[PDB]
Amino acid sequence: GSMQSTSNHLWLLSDILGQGATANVFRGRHKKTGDLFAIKVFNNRPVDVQMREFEVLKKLNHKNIVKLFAIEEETTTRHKVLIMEFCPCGSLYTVLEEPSNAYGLPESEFLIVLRDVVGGMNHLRENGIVHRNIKPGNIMRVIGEDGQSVYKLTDFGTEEYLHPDMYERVLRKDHATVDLWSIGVTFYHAATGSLPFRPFEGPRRNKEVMYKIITGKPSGAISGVQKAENGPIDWSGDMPVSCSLSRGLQVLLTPVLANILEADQEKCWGFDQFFAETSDILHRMVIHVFSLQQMTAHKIYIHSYNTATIFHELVYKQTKIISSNQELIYEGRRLVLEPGRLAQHFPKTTEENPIFVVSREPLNTIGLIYEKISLPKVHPRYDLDGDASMAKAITGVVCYACRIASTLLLYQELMRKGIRWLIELIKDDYNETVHKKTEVVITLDFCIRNIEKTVKVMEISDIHTKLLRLSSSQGTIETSLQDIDSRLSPGGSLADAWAHQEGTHPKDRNVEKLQVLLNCMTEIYYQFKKDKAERRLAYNEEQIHKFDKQKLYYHATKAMTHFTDECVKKYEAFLNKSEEWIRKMLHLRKQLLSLTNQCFDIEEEVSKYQEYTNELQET
Amino acid sequence: GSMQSTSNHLWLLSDILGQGATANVFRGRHKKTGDLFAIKVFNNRPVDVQMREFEVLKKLNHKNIVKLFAIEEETTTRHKVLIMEFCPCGSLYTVLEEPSNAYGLPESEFLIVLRDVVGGMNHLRENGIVHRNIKPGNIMRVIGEDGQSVYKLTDFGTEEYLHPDMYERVLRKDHATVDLWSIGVTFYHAATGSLPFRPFEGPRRNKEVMYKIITGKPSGAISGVQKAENGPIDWSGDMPVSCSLSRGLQVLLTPVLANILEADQEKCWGFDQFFAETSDILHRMVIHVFSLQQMTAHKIYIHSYNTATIFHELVYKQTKIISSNQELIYEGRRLVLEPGRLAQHFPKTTEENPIFVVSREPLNTIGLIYEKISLPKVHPRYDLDGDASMAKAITGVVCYACRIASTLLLYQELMRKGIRWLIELIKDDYNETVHKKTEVVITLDFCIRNIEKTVKVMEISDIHTKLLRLSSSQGTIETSLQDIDSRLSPGGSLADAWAHQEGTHPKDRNVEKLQVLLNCMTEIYYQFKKDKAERRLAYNEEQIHKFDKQKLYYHATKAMTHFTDECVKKYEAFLNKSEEWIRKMLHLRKQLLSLTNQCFDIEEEVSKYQEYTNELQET
Ligand SMILES: O=C(NCCCNc1nc(Nc2cccc(CN3CCOCC3)c2)ncc1C1CC1)C1CCC1
Ligand SMILES: O=C(NCCCNc1nc(Nc2cccc(CN3CCOCC3)c2)ncc1C1CC1)C1CCC1
């Protein structure tokens, strides 16, 4: 294949990375080093209006802006080319096309996108530039030297991302907020895998319905979807259930989207507010909490300099457990946080190693709430464009099922761990009061006798009668403690055994079994992606394509069956069993507490007769 | 490209999987389904001597034997082809060629290899078959439905793997043990990434030196390496330091290899013993233990039905901490194992969540012992065969550095966790004795007074003088406890802070930084693998190959520098700091114990004068 060139670079025309009305982008090399670069070639002012604007871009130095290195002349034409930083990974679009991102980015990746888009935007503004159309295709991805994605803006200076005024397309007036809109759509797309505003069929098919959805949108709504043809619009101010972002993050993100997806730019946020509100999210650290009675994991987004008081409030918001009722467990022991303890001084947590919260007050066992998504039907009609689109969708469904399977397993593993720890904690309490009791018996049983000690050496009868009631009261405690110990023992009604008998375990390798099926589906999907780009298949490759179409469905059905019949069913049995075990536990702790307070009441009444034994003497 | 065929199958001649003197193996498809199969075509008794042997193989049904499905006639020739199970992953050879396996398989994979080879071998024997030459190329890998490798034997009925009698090449006499030899070599290769018997240069280059090494091999040795030309042989009965297998596994594997790599078949093990000894390994479960004072992780290979007594003995073997001195910690709390408790009833562990062992007796802080491996020099001479070989080696070195970096980080993370837990445990002890003390003060300070109580109501002077010494003795305890509490406090000499200040942390992302560099090296390695197979490169591809040769070295140097300067240096500082913190801790626990025993001594002497207060009375 032929290639163009300049003094320092050359590039195959086959290795094209991007195509715009203004220019083409190819992947090329430095002739002398061999290093990869993106070559931007313009097809066609006044002459120096661009040479100037080329210069300003060369000056821009920021982590979140794709770098413009040099401006050279192509060899065959004297036309200007731009040598720009090559981004091997591609764009946010590339990422969002992965079947595993069909329902939104993983939370960690979403946060990098949020951070980098925001930092890039701000840098432009800081230099006076406006990037009229941000979109996943504009947002380039590179692997940072620490293995983390870095997102970088390029091509500054589409329908689904255009503002309602921009979607109409008068010069966009003249002076921005319009940029916040495509940012809003972009962030929603990244969070959910879908566009927020969706006419039935496609936006392009119904340009008019799309405009109606966006202008007639009620304030606060962040999405509007038409599910049937010519049907009404389902509005929402919330993220879809299928979104993977934590409730903690959803609660912060939602208001931002709502306030930058606002039609009347009168009430749009403006950049500075947007920058403040997004930075406030980005600057928060995350503390992982697991609600043991609700069977729910939580991410608490809290500032380094925030107190435990604020932490408790944030936990109440997600659990509805008031601060005073929040009992914390971490790495096998109670965690007691002083009110003014800064979050940066909290113990380190992960999703696998969270702080557990428990309450002495009854709570509904919730578990994981997720979307029930079935396989789309597979259209038997051979079609390279349709099949690749379908392959993506059905693989996307199985990926989601796999992510849920993983979360379900995690929830069960955390449950088992928290329960194990809580039982040991309760046992400490049982042992703490049992010492306290035996400790007061030793003085009570001693002082009850010390009275008669003097008699052998007229009212005392009134002292013995009230006291012998205490020993009798202590007999009632003994038998009740023996009953609690009995329940905490291996055969006890608060036994652990069921937790190892119910649900699913790592050794079951359910996640891995599903991943294997997913991997088969993903290979076929990518091949279909190849088959689409190649317009026609030869007879053999055609049949093989049709065979694997059936194989896709076969793999998907097998996965879903395993997921529902094995993963979900056993999870729901474990959950139902947990719910009863929780109920018993609360009842036991409540009875134990009562026995403990009785031990304190008895102890102090005995600490009163200890002195009343000795009278004043004549001397 | 042309393809051969049969009624049911067809295959490109380009898609060849394997080549033997007897037959070729291609990757083909069922014509009607499209399903992949291995087609084995024979090039050439008597006629039915093979039709019979083909039939016996068709009957063989085992997980660890590659399946023979059918025997069909090719279309152009009436020649017999075998349709066999296609193994998408390839062979153990394929696996061992990966740069990340240059120093042996990961322990988990090695165990699957051990299991599957053994199960396959046994199945053959159970049917009377002998597989004269097992080798990594004979051992096929498939992904099991649970995502785990399954290894399968094929091609039954090389130099480095041949027995000394076989290496000579008289009909191999007639009747096996000879098979155990290539099994021995294979397992050693899998464990270490290298052949056990290595003349200088290559075995093929020095067929004579190789035979000398193997026959003149002293008993017990499992390897023999000639490091210089015409130089002596370094024998070893142990695994190389660079081996990744745990000491626990190494201790069991080594004797097996030594006894099946035995020259004189007089003293070779024989199959049944081999099957017993290997099964005994495969049937053991693993308990992860971390020695906190030695800074060493351990895998304890123990039977389900073994007792804690046996467990302690196994731990002593790897740590040299006698049973009685072994103090166990798990998930933040002491673990007390009853002597007869079966290992299957132990708490579940992983490398990340081990049982910690500590001792009140001094131990040398060891840390991780690993091989210091430097980069090979890169030969500037362009050579497709040499460069691909070199690329593999240098990438192999960086992978090893990456695995070590990971283990070093883990060791530090475990240290930090164990220390954190131990400090809380010591604090419990401090609080347990402090209650005990105040508890006896309340009776001592009471009974010291109860004496004078009677006087106000001739020898007592002898009672007060011994007793006032006890209160004085209790004053000496109080001040000593206040000194221990002081050390356990945030400013205390047993502070935790250094552990968060020294070494490296997950947030440093050192492992990930190295992985990125490794990924760049691995892409180039695979391209070189492609460049080798293609005999010559065009001018451009040639230069690019030479450029990336320099890039390989650049990436490797950067990685090693980061590893030594950042990972290793900070690890060694953390280790040195740990060593002193351990020393203090032992001293503190020793002083605390002493204060605790004094609290018991005082307590019982006071529990004697409690009754001696009251005399017999006339009545
Ligand atoms: O830049 C634009 N649009 C989208 C981005 C095309 N640009 C790039 N793509 C890339 N990389 C890239 C683009 C698309 C796909 C991929 C992934 N491919 C996988 C297969 O092997 C080739 C890379 C990589 N790097 C840099 C750039 C230019 C300098 C900013 C403007 C619209 C036409 C110009
Ligand atoms: O079987 C023999 N030698 C080595 C194994 C060749 N056989 C196979 N290879 C495979 N798979 C395989 C072999 C080599 C490489 C690979 C990996 N390739 C990666 C690139 O895409 C094609 C597969 C896969 N499957 C089955 C078989 C035969 C039925 C037992 C005997 C020696 C010649 C016959």
Curated annotation (Swiss-Prot), chains A, B:
Annotated consequence of substituting residue 540 to A: Reduced phosphorylation of STING1
Superkingdom of origin organism: Eukaryota
Effect of residue 377 to R: Decreases ubiquitination. Abolishes ubiquitination, phosphorylation and kinase activity
Sequence position, cross-link Glycyl lysine isopeptide (Lys-Gly) (interchain with G-Cter in ubiquitin): 32, 377
Tissue expression profile of the protein: Ubiquitous with higher expression in testis. Expressed in the ganglion cells, nerve fiber layer and microvasculature of the retina.
Result of altering residue 32 to R: Decreases ubiquitination. Abolishes ubiquitination, phosphorylation and kinase activity
A Pfam family recorded for this sequence: TBK1_CCD1
Molecular function as annotated in GO: ATP binding; identical protein binding; nucleic acid binding; phosphoprotein binding; protein kinase activity; protein phosphatase binding; protein serine kinase activity; protein serine/threonine kinase activity
Keyword Phosphoprotein appears in the UniProt entry: yes
CDD domains (UniProt xref): STKc_TBK1, TBK1_C, Ubl_TBK1
Compartments where located: Cytoplasm
EC number in record: 2.7.11.1
Cellular component aspect of the GO annotation: cytoplasm; cytosol; intracellular membrane-bounded organelle; nucleoplasm; serine/threonine protein kinase complex
Result for mutant: residue 521 to R: In FTDALS4; loss of kinase activity
Residues with PTM N6-methyllysine: 569
Post-translation changes: Phosphorylation requires homodimerization and ubiquitination at Lys-32 and Lys-377. (Microbial infection) Interaction with SARS-CoV-2 M protein induces 'Lys-48'-linked ubiquitination which leads to proteasomal degradation.
Annotated active site: 133 (proton acceptor)
Effect recorded for residue 615 to Q: No effect on IFNB induction
Similarity-based family: Belongs to the protein kinase superfamily. Ser/Thr protein kinase family. I-kappa-B kinase subfamily.
Comment block on domains: Comprises A N-terminal kinase domain, a ubiquitin-like domain and a C-terminal coiled-coil region mediating homodimerization.
UniProt disease annotation: Glaucoma 1, open angle, P: A form of primary open angle glaucoma (POAG). POAG is characterized by a specific pattern of optic nerve and visual field defects. The angle of the anterior chamber of the eye is open, and usually the intraocular pressure is increased. However, glaucoma can occur at any intraocular pressure. The disease is generally asymptomatic until the late stages, by which time significant and irreversible optic nerve damage has already taken place. GLC1P is characterized by early onset, thin central corneas and low intraocular pressure.
Note: In cancer cells, pathological TBK1 activation promotes oncogenic transformation by suppressing programmed cell death. Mechanistically, the RALB-SEC5/EXOC2-TBK1 signaling cascade seems to participate in both innate immune signaling and cell transformation. Additionally, TBK1 supports oncogenesis by directly phosphorylating and activating AKT1 at the exocyst.
Protein name per its UniProtKB record: Serine/threonine-protein kinase TBK1
Species for this entry: Homo sapiens
Gene name in the database record: TBK1
